Amino acid sequence: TPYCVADYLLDRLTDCGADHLFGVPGDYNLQFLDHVIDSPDICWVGCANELNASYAADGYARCKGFAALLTTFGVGELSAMNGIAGSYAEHVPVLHIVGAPGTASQQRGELLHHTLGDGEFRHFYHMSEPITVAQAILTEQNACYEIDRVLTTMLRERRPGYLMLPADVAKKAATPPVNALTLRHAHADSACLKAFRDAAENRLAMSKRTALLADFLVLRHGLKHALQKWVKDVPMAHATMLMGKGIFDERHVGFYGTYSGSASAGAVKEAIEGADTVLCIGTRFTDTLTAGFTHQLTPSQTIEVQPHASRVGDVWFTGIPMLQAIETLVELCKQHVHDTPVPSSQPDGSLTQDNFWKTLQTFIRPGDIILADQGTSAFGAIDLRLPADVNFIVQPLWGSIGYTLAAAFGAQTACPNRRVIVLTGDGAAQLTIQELGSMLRDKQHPIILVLNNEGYTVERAIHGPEQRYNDIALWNWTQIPQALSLDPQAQCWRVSEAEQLADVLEKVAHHERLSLIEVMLPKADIPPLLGAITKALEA
Amino acid sequence: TPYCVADYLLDRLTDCGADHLFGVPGDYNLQFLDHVIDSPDICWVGCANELNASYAADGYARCKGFAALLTTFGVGELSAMNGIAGSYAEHVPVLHIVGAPGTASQQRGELLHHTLGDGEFRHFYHMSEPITVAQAILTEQNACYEIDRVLTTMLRERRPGYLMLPADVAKKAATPPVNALTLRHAHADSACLKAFRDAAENRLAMSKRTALLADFLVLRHGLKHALQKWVKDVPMAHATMLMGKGIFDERHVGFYGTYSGSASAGAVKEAIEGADTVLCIGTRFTDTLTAGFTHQLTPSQTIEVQPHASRVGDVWFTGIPMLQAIETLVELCKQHVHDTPVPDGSLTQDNFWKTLQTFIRPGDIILADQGTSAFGAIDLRLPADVNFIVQPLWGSIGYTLAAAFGAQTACPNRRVIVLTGDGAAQLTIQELGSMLRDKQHPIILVLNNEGYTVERAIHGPEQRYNDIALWNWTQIPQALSLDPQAQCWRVSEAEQLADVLEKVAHHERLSLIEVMLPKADIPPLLGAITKALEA
Ligand SMILES: CC1=C(CCOP(=O)(O)OP(=O)(O)O)S/C(=C(/O)Cc2ccccc2)N1Cc1cnc(C)nc1N
Ligand SMILES: CC1=C(CCOP(=O)(O)OP(=O)(O)O)S/C(=C(/O)Cc2ccccc2)N1Cc1cnc(C)nc1N
Ligand SMILES: [Mg+2]
Ligand SMILES: [Mg+2]
């Protein structure tokens, strides 16, 4: 077994932070899979389908900073395309490796399985172009430097890449690299950085009260600790939006709640929208994050930092790495922001939205990985007051229901020793249910809370509440582990009272087995954030 | 509720033969969905996810000749793209309707949910271009004629189409048409037809024995009855390949078995490959259908008919509808009509398919997935009026279970038999909940050999990447339904399987039969497909 292109790719995977490879086998990638199995550094994780595999890689990358997905030509890669699209939309670096027919077969235009029957082998490569920052068709003549180019581009942009790996190319001789693949930190031209610094200082020097709004690009580019240390060294009002929730210890002084435009709590609206200057760090003001674009933040009121450019008022400064922009603003805030922010300011009976999130509030602990799906789950979890060291995974920009259950399998794989809490609606869990079987096969011990209100009630709040299209098949949730496993190491409960939920949670606190809690909720009940976003449109 | 573009689309859809709409709702398509629900002519079928919905629409179209899928912008449409791709590969006319944000929101480049966060709203429309024969972004200024163009092209090519329907556009005023949407049958230029006819006649006139090989394009273009009457009027050796199986009543004189190249039975190879002239009607010699391209048929041996062109020997004649080409060859064959077609205990692959052989009946809809299922079902000798649905060109496992939901939706009064491996059924399992919700009564046979066993035959039989999570198959219906009313068996002996099949013969409930089979057991064609490739 001489070292070959397959091994070089796998060595580069580990360089990038991936210790696992998710996917589904097929004849076009089996021989590559032999190298994954034999590899001492990469562990193959077979998933129940390719869409779930791509979701799981996404959740994995949100825990480890990088992930990789393996599918087979045509039927595999096209099944995973919604996952890669979501990773592109939310800036998640997942590498899509596609095992493909050998080059000679492709050159001959053979009528092969997993093609459109036209002799064409590049349709699917081209269809992946809009949802990747870099891609390559690997050949004997380009393999190792195209592998390095694509991965390096993914590390810089924190976004998916694509590699088509014909089976014959994977076997071609290669040489183990001596140095690990690392992305050299870019540096702005010092005069260009100076221009942004002076403009930022001039604005901050005249600001009576300055607030800090950080969001998900902070997480993606490895800058969480920089922003926590920022607000510890320079106390001031700070918040995230829904996407970046978990950047901050939300018990710390200066944090008043998550910002969601006009849907924000009063203290948040005053802390953020009331400031003369708001530093927007890695922010994207989406419809869901801003309660239908009802945020009140003007250009002259704001300084914003993006991955490659920063803005002060109306002026953009391009070619500035987000790290240097943040370092500059931290120094300037230390100079001009001198504030002591005002400190921030049991449930029983039938389960409601209100007492559910109140009960869950008392249960979460540092170290938790919390994932919530679109619907009442994510928009109720926004009100959770996260303690330190919480990884909060939500997908509100792409917004694909079913992501959460499969992403939790990936996240638990990345962090076997952390407690994983899955908040999914009954509708959302149906789309990716088969993964739960992957969790049980692998003896994972997540806490899965299925918010069962018997249908799609987000939509009901949006439109046609009694329309039959918002109904679903009613499942027997507590019987699913025993159906998707011959011997599940799981325990299931069905709860309808707040105190039953409290007792159950208490019992599974140390997550010795997989837990599935079917949470009985009213059909029309919606969390406060939804009530303002259902109203957000239609004019 | 004035008649609007949403209604015009629905009226045209039913014109094309679809009485159902599969999909998953989302805020960008809810208002369109109101028109689907209120319409007396189209029935909404909510599916458990968009990939399954696209699979089900595909199966529906293989029964009714047309189908439609509704998804939401971005997350919905991209989840269904493998389904539409398979429909394109195997020439299945599925219309993909995508409910989209209003045009004003799109023109402003808003940071909307289900976008890539860049303000761009045409990425996904463009990614669907290679897997559709026609597509359109519907506007207030083009709506009705783009709907007619796209649907007309689907009818012509029997392939998927795509329409993006912004929410505001759906609500725009429209007028009910007085005529249904129809595709006028194309006619070749008479000189062009004569050239083909002459060449075909001169070649057939010198044939001592002529054989007929028809496949799936016959099914897609509605020519099944034409092919059956052809071989009834002109008896001769005939066969299909795997994709088109079910074109013929396989008990008829002249039929000796399904053609699969060098993997064919000896009598099939002699009947087909031994004839001096072989009529190849709607055939595509894919790797799976020909045992790794080991078919022995020369250009001078063959006359071939494709949708828009036909070939005699080395000469192609383009611009001839396959309907006219078939009618021409039928008449010519009538002019040269000569020769008359002449004449346990433990479950194994062998005794399983023999047991299933005695069970199938006219009227069955039989679906088989890639793996031992499809490569064993090829040896079934089908009776009359059987719809045999297999996907060997695209080859996406999981297709079969979800397609069975669509096929049963199309034909509630026909018996549906699902042949799926344990591995394949895991990819689309949730759709079983849809069958249970809709009170469907298919017979689902899960071939449980505890892993991906076709892969085991290809490469790495002992490698753990060919293993799967072991499910408790007979317990799944009671998990995906509060009142499944389903009949489940686990069988390990041929005689238990025979007994169980008698009990579910009239399919009064949904049945799930978990068939325990050996891990290394391979049906005859699979052993021959993975011996042409192992080289
Ligand atoms: C079906 C659906 C929801 C049912 C939840 O059902 P469920 O799990 O039961 O939750 P809930 O009943 O507690 O509310 S939400 C939803 C959203 O686009 C969420 C949203 C709505 C308005 C504004 C922003 C986001 N879709 C659409 C949708 C469809 N297909 C896929 C792959 N992805 C989606 N997202
Ligand atoms: C995983 C797999 C099989 C396991 C069956 O497991 P199972 O259901 O259990 O069947 P069985 O063999 O054990 O009876 S087959 C298979 C093929 O590409 C089939 C084939 C290969 C070569 C030539 C012709 C066909 N793949 C690959 C594959 C992966 N992902 C998707 C969406 N689709 C696929 N197709
Ligand atoms: Mg619900
Ligand atoms: Mg199997």
Short mmCIF file of N, CA and C in Angstrom, two decimals, chain B residues 17 31 147 242 283:
data_model
loop_
_atom_site.label_atom_id
_atom_site.label_comp_id
_atom_site.label_asym_id
_atom_site.label_seq_id
_atom_site.Cartn_x
_atom_site.Cartn_y
_atom_site.Cartn_z
N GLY B 17 -52.01 15.46 -17.15
CA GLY B 17 -52.27 14.15 -16.60
C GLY B 17 -51.99 13.99 -15.11
N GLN B 31 -49.24 30.44 0.00
CA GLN B 31 -50.37 31.07 -0.68
C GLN B 31 -50.72 30.34 -1.97
N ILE B 147 -45.45 28.99 -18.73
CA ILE B 147 -46.02 27.76 -18.20
C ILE B 147 -46.31 26.79 -19.33
N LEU B 242 -33.33 -4.39 -18.40
CA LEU B 242 -33.86 -4.22 -17.05
C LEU B 242 -34.76 -2.99 -16.95
N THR B 283 -33.83 1.96 -26.73
CA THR B 283 -32.84 1.26 -25.91
C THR B 283 -31.68 2.18 -25.56
#
